[PDB]
Amino acid sequence: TEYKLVVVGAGGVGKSALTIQLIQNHFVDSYRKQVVIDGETCLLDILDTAEGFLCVFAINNTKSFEDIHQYREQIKRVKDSDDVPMVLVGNKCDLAARTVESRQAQDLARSYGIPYIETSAKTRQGVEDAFYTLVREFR
Ligand SMILES: Nc1nc2c(ncn2[C@@H]2O[C@H](COP(=O)(O)OP(=O)(O)O)[C@@H](O)[C@H]2O)c(=O)[nH]1
Numbered sequence: 001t002e003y004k005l006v007v008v009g010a011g012g013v014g015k016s017a018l019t020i021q022l023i024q025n026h027f028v029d030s031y032r033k034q035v036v037i038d039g040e041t042c043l044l045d046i047l048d049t050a051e052g053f054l055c056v057f058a059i060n061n062t063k064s065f066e067d068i069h070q071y072r073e074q075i076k077r078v079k080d081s082d083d084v085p086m087v088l089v090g091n092k093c094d095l096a097a098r099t100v101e102s103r104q105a106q107d108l109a110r111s112y113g114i115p116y117i118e119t120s121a122k123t124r125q126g127v128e129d130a131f132y133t134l135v136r137e138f139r
Contacts (some may be wrong), residue, residue, distance in 0.1 A: 001042040003106040005047040009056035010064035017121035019048040037132045052085035060088045085137035094120040
């Protein structure tokens with residue numbers, strides 16, 4: 001179950017930090033892990049890049065947010081669908097240096113028909129929520 005939770009974003013947004021937090025539960029390749037989400041026991045196979053896509057930007061990195069659009073166009077163009085499980089993640093919410101406003105990310109996730117989750121991989125704030133939210137978009 002559950003290919004491939006491909007985690008994709010601009011360098012240094014926190015794709016590695018988020019994933020290892022999920023798998024290895026510590027703040028610092030592919031991973032497979034049996035999880036329970038809303039009662040179901042399923043397998044996450046997670047591709048941390050260097051079926052479902054976790055699209056990550058950093059809330060202090062404006063370029064990494066504007067890159068979101070290219071990732072989306074490349075996803076619609078490869079799955080031939082405007083409904084492929086995908087979640088927009090605003091990482092690094094623990095920082096005060098926010099150049100990307102919550103509303104912007106949300107208005108973008110809106111026009112895509114996809115959820116938006118603000119996260120911190122440093123604190124584990126909202127990490128399960130982001131991945132588990134990606135799985136719920138399959139259902
Ligand atoms: N303050 C803060 N720093 C972070 C967060 N996520 C990642 N980092 C830092 O950003 C650096 C690079 O992030 P990384 O996990 O390598 O993202 P990746 O290169 O896209 O895989 C790491 O040294 C982390 O310590 C976060 O949520 N908050």
